[PDB]
Amino acid sequence: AGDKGIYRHYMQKEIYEQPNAIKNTLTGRISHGQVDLSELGPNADELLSKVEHIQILACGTSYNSGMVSRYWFESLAGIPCDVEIASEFRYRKSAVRRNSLMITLSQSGETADTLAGLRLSKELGYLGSLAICNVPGSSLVRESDLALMTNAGTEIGVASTKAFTTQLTVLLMLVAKLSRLKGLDASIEHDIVHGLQALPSRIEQMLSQDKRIEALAEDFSDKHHALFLGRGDQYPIALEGALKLKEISYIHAEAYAAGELKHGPLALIDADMPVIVVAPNNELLEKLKSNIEEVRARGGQLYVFADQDAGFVSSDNMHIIEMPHVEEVIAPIFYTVPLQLLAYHVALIKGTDVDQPRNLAKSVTVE
Amino acid sequence: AGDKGIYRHYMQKEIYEQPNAIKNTLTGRISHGQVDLSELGPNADELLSKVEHIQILACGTSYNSGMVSRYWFESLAGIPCDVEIASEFRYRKSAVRRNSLMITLSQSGETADTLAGLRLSKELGYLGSLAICNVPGSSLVRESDLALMTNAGTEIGVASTKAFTTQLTVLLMLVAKLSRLKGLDASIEHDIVHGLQALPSRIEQMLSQDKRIEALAEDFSDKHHALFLGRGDQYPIALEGALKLKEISYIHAEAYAAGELKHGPLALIDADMPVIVVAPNNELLEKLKSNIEEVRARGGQLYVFADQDAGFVSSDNMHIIEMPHVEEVIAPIFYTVPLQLLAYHVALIKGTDVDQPRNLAKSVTVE
Ligand SMILES: N[C@@H](CO)[C@@H](O)[C@H](O)[C@H](O)COP(=O)(O)O
Numbered sequence: 001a002g003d004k005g006i007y008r009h010y011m012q013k014e015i016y017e018q019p020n021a022i023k024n025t026l027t028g029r030i031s032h033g034q035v036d037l038s039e040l041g042p043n044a045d046e047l048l049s050k051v052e053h054i055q056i057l058a059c060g061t062s063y064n065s066g067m068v069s070r071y072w073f074e075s076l077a078g079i080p081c082d083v084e085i086a087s088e089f090r091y092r093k094s095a096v097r098r099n100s101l102m103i104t105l106s107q108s109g110e111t112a113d114t115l116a117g118l119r120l121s122k123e124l125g126y127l128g129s130l131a132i133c134n135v136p137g138s139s140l141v142r143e144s145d146l147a148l149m150t151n152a153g154t155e156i157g158v159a160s161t162k163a164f165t166t167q168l169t170v171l172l173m174l175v176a177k178l179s180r181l182k183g184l185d186a187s188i189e190h191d192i193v194h195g196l197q198a199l200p201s202r203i204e205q206m207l208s209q210d211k212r213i214e215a216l217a218e219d220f221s222d223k224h225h226a227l228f229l230g231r232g233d234q235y236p237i238a239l240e241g242a243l244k245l246k247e248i249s250y251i252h253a254e255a256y257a258a259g260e261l262k263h264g265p266l267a268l269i270d271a272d273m274p275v276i277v278v279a280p281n282n283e284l285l286e287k288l289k290s291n292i293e294e295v296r297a298r299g300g301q302l303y304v305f306a307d308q309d310a311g312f313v314s315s316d317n318m319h320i321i322e323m324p325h326v327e328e329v330i331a332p333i334f335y336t337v338p339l340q341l342l343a344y345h346v347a348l349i350k351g352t353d354v355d356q357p358r359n360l361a362k363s364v365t366v367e
Numbered sequence: 368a369g370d371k372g373i374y375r376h377y378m379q380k381e382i383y384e385q386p387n388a389i390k391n392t393l394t395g396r397i398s399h400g401q402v403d404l405s406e407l408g409p410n411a412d413e414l415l416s417k418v419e420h421i422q423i424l425a426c427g428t429s430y431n432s433g434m435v436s437r438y439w440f441e442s443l444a445g446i447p448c449d450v451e452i453a454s455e456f457r458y459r460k461s462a463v464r465r466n467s468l469m470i471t472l473s474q475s476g477e478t479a480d481t482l483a484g485l486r487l488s489k490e491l492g493y494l495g496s497l498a499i500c501n502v503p504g505s506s507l508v509r510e511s512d513l514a515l516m517t518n519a520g521t522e523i524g525v526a527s528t529k530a531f532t533t534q535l536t537v538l539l540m541l542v543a544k545l546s547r548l549k550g551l552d553a554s555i556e557h558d559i560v561h562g563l564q565a566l567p568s569r570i571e572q573m574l575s576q577d578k579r580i581e582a583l584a585e586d587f588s589d590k591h592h593a594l595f596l597g598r599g600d601q602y603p604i605a606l607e608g609a610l611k612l613k614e615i616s617y618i619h620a621e622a623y624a625a626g627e628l629k630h631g632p633l634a635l636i637d638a639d640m641p642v643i644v645v646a647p648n649n650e651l652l653e654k655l656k657s658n659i660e661e662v663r664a665r666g667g668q669l670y671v672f673a674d675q676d677a678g679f680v681s682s683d684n685m686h687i688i689e690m691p692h693v694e695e696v697i698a699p700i701f702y703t704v705p706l707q708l709l710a711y712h713v714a715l716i717k718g719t720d721v722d723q724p725r726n727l728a729k730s731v732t733v734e
């Protein structure tokens with residue numbers, strides 16, 4: 001499988017390779033401050049400029065990356081985007097949108113549900129298909145019209161880390177390139193390229209503070225439940241942080257849109273169910289603190305990952321886990337890191353099988 | 368709040384009122400075997416025929432009804448449909464679709480997030496708005512262009528039951544009416560009207576077998592977790608059955624698309640986490656049984672709600688909970704019932720506050 005070097009597990013290694021991985025993914029693609037996707041060929045732009053809707057299919061952690069990207073495609077490139085679990089798409093009769101581009105996200109490029117949604121799509125009237133993948137020569141790559149490799153290097157750990165952040169990096173580059181094809185304000189693209197060029201050092205910063213996440217992991221290591229909350233583009237990061245905690249600690253962690261906490265889940269919260277919040281602004285955190293106060297009688301606690309610049313202050317049931325300020329455009333990618341490290345340190349404390357969590361496999365090559 | 372008559376709780380009452388409620392919702396709307404929405408006025412059809420995309424906003428149980436309907440709008444009326452949590456829509460910059468109809472679903476008609484998504488939408492370029500609601504003269508009704516009341520009678524129980532099934536009934540009628548405006552095969556509409564006219568007696572049948580659900584409730588009443596799985600149009604019913612179990616039993620029940628069980632959650636399953644499956648076909652059940660077998664060493668068990676006609680047979684770790692055959696078009700509505708009764712009987716056994724579950728309120732009139 002490969003040399004782990006100084007890391008104890010492939011996953012830890014892959015988490016620490018994120019900066020170099022994202023660097024590698026940017027290589028050849030940034031030319032004079034603009035996204036250069038010329039690796040796609042001379043007719044690529046013709047197709048891309050035709051796109052009026054983007055459809056994304058994937059499973060697991062790859063669906064979570066697609067979900068983040070939808071907020072980018074719509075808010076920044078102004079393009080309608082839908083993301084769907086691959087198995088759900090493949091078994092339903094769908095209404096295909098005018099001039100829709102079909103994108104599949106997959107680390108392995110072999111996931112059966114995703115490969116099937118792609119095969120099916122060819123007969124449904126899509127403008128064409130684009131594979132974002134980390135494995136060259138894999139089926140999803142071979143069978144798509146276009147492919148943008150993430151170039152993260154091989155990922156051996158079953159719970160994906162660098163493949164996810166490099167996927168979001170390729171996605172943001174596509175959003176950039178599409179904002180330009182649509183003749184949208186050039187600042188949209190520059191903000192993205194700048195967020196991207198900073199990203200590697202911003203994660204390297206996040207990594208240097210791993211010891212603080214380790215301490216936090218002690219408060220979750222004996223818990224059997226956890227609720228992860230996020231709003232907008234951080235909603236999917238909360239999805240991804242609960243998936244990672246499920247995957248390698250086996251804790252029953254579920255994600256929720258922050259605004260729906262009150263429409264149900266507050267009834268479950270007690271001391272055995274910590275609530276994590278991913279990069280909330282002030283207005284949202286005020287609501288959440290008011291919600292957690294409703295459950296103080298049961299020891300409800302909020303754990304808030306947030307920009308030190310927001311000025312939030314920890315209280316007895318609200319713990320601010322301060323992070324460096326970072327560019328809004330890349331914040332979803334950056335806030336993933338602490339959630340990967342949290343899951344990893346909980347797994348270490350418990351002594352679970354990080355690189356091969358029970359009953360899971362790197363890629364599900366069967367439907 | 369009203370006479371409970373012979374029922375112990377408003378919720379139980381509201382669950383047993385479903386047949387009469389759905390009847391009441393169909394009243395005046397079925398004319399010579401076709402959906403008659405003429406209550407909307409003379410220009411309604413002009414607008415509706417213009418629709419090329421449907422956007423639905425709601426929270427909680429109302430979002431779950433919208434999610435079911437998306438599969439109907441796309442598979443039957445051939446119309447692109449997107450459903451979004453109201454809070455998520457209201458805080459993001461979205462890409463509005465060409466000729467999009469905006470629909471809000473709300474029992475109370477006052478939910479702040481949903482009312483806000485509606486207000487915002489007026490300035491975004493939607494063809495117009497339609498409120499499906501159970502409270503007349505409520506804000507969402509007053510402020511929308513069109514409204515289709517569910518006429519379920521008042522719902523006092525905090526966890527919604529008849530408002531949800533009457534919402535899905537109004538939704539299927541709209542799908543029918545739109546298939547006709549698009550000049551689609553007339554059978555689509557007749558299948559729906561027939562499924563609908565049968566529905567009341569089909570639920571009355573489901574209700575007569577309440578004693579069998581009660582027995583099943585004993586197997587969940589001491590559990591702290593539960594995974595609900597569903598595929599396609601039953602995926603949202605699994606969402607709704609896990610929400611109900613969360614709401615009134617306080618058990619940590621989460622729903623998952625059946626095809627993603629393998630992409631994560633299988634690592635969590637043990638004896639303290641029963642897996643429920645909602646109306647799977649043979650192909651899907653074979654996969655799920657193969658998945659549950661992977662976790663036999665930890666006592667993993669599947670509880671399958673399914674058409675007696677499928678011929679499924681119970682085994683030591685797969686319990687078939689047989690149901691009468693029903694028309695495919697209304698199956699999502701019918702399979703909701705047993706999940707409402709399961710939650711209700713678990714709550715009864717535990718002695719939790721069914722009609723006012725801890726920390727919840729009928730409608731969340733604040734954001
Ligand atoms: N390994 C898991 C992610 O941590 C799993 O959910 C994975 O994301 C899923 O199987 C999709 O795999 P793919 O990206 O290779 O398509």
Ligand SMILES: N[C@@H](CO)[C@@H](O)[C@H](O)[C@H](O)COP(=O)(O)O
Pocket residue numbers: 263264425426427428429472473474475476477478481525526527614728729730731
């Ligand atoms: N009462 C709950 C449903 O059982 C809650 O989630 C509710 O669905 C949500 O508040 C939406 O309310 P509404 O339908 O009145 O808009």
Ligand code: NA
Pocket residue numbers: 231232233234
């Ligand atoms: Na945001």
Ligand code: NA
Pocket residue numbers: 598599600601
């Ligand atoms: Na189906």
